[PDB]
Design a protein around this ligand. Sequence first.
Ligand code: SF4
Lengths: 69, 72
Amino acid sequence: LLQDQLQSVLDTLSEREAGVVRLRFGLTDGQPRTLDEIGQVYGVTRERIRQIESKTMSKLRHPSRSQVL
Amino acid sequence: DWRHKAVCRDEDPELFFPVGNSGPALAQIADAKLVCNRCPVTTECLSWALNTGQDSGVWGGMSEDERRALKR
Ligand code: SF4
């Protein structure tokens, strides 16, 4: 479904960025984590999480990629 | 829909997300804009990126810094 393009976008990020997004969206174990929990696991600020999320979403929604109906 | 006519669907998506090291990726930004310059939906793409607030990447023939400069 969306998995293919989403995993494709995750592949373009660093391991740490991709971990941050997987925890934020609950992709790996089905449990989205809070900003506090993510900042504790990967040692990143809330503004840095915001930027990672924003960048990932721009990549996912860019017209270069087919979108999910 | 305009996304149907995006010529960047035939490109490496990462072309449109340049990262620089100690400065702007001037060449990669130009390379992305070159695709936008042969795209029939540059204006719709730029309008959508601006209206939905896409911060990262090249959209509608504009770099991320250029769209940021337009915005408040
Ligand atoms: S203007 Fe550029 S980013 Fe937008 S659809 Fe066309 S090629 Fe893709």
